[PDB]
Design a binder for this molecule. Structure first.
Ligand SMILES: Nc1nc2c(ncn2[C@@H]2O[C@H](COP(=O)(O)OP(=O)(O)O)[C@@H](O)[C@H]2O)c(=O)[nH]1
Ligand SMILES: Nc1nc2c(ncn2[C@@H]2O[C@H](COP(=O)(O)OP(=O)(O)O)[C@@H](O)[C@H]2O)c(=O)[nH]1
Lengths: 178, 178
């Protein structure tokens, strides 16, 4: 369902999705990864101002994509195409925002409904640079990740803490499964 | 509505679309351009087997995209997002297929309805390598192109005849307009 074409030849791509509440740092996290790896990102607009943000890694055969949460709430068909056949997820919350963490069960259900049976998930508590504003203890994140069957890390898009770790670890979980 | 992000910075991209009847050579034409320029193309699946095929040129700031005709017939919202804010079109027919040429008025209406007011269009008679199978005289293509306000070329994706000419000429029409 996701392919790369180059010089007459085709190969598969891993569809990896970053999801979570508006304003948890999904775009920042994707863009920090792009910047870290000297890769461009592409941003396309749907409707008034809803965004699709995409990074392609050629050698590594991964497509990383955000379809904004506010967009997912407005467009059913675009959203189901977005989730359909996703291989892995970064499921993101903000350690400084309790509601974003409370939404995780709901995002978990989203993953199982719409995406591949064996899709691997990493729960990421983002904004770990903002310790002074934390409201979600690390132990809550670790324990939910355990009961939902996800991997778990805290990260910082702003400080480049555990940004690469996330995607390389996700592809590894995917390959190990298959 | 189409942006590139690279190393902390943003710029605009030109959204260029290739449209026309199934099997006129749109994919072949896009892929030949990708191959000519040492660029990858990306192919994403919507529904059972409907494809979105995309080439990005970074330096030149152009996004070239096919959303399969059979897909356009099935998914309204995806299709309107596809056309919305298109800057230019390659409107393709097959010189060996009369129906594909008869559809051109209908594709022309499509362009005006759904896309930018000043969107530039090139009418391309593809498969010009197959002279022995021609059923659409060049003069018909030239005359329709004149009455619809389009540029016009015959081309061959298979033989690499007028493939680059098409996109570089399209961006030029776009810039000249603005
Ligand atoms: N301190 C800090 N702020 C962040 C981090 N990631 C994102 N932000 C900020 O959180 C807000 C939302 O980020 P954004 O990437 O747009 O979130 P999205 O809506 O989930 O895509 C913005 O003001 C970002 O600058 C982080 O790691 N640390
Ligand atoms: N002879 C010739 N055949 C072509 C050319 N372009 C496409 N084709 C063939 O026409 C058929 C449809 O091409 P495709 O690129 O899939 O058309 P699309 O459905 O419009 O994307 C395929 O068998 C292609 O190999 C061309 O320039 N010359």
């Amino acid at each position: 369902r996701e392919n790369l074409y180059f010089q007459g030849n085709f190969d598969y791509m891993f569809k990896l999705l970053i999801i979570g509440n508006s304003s948890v740092g999904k775009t920042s996290f994707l863009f920090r990864y792009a910047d870290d790896t000297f890769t461009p990102a592409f941003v396309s607009t749907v409707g008034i101002d809803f965004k699709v943000k995409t990074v392609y890694r050629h050698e590594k055969r991964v497509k990383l994509q955000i379809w904004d949460t506010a967009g997912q709430e407005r467009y059913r068909t675009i959203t189901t195409a977005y989730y359909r056949g996703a291989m892995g997820f970064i499921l993101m919350y903000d350690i400084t925002n309790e509601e974003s963490f409370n939404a995780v069960q709901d995002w978990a259900t989203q993953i199982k409904t719409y995406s591949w049976d064996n899709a691997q998930v990493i729960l990421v508590g983002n904004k770990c640079d903002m310790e002074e504003e934390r409201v979600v203890p690390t132990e809550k994140g670790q324990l939910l990740a355990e009961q939902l069957g996800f991997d778990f890390f805290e990260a910082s898009a702003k400080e480049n803490i555990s940004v690469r770790q996330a995607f390389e670890r996700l592809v590894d979980a995917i390959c190990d499964k298959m």
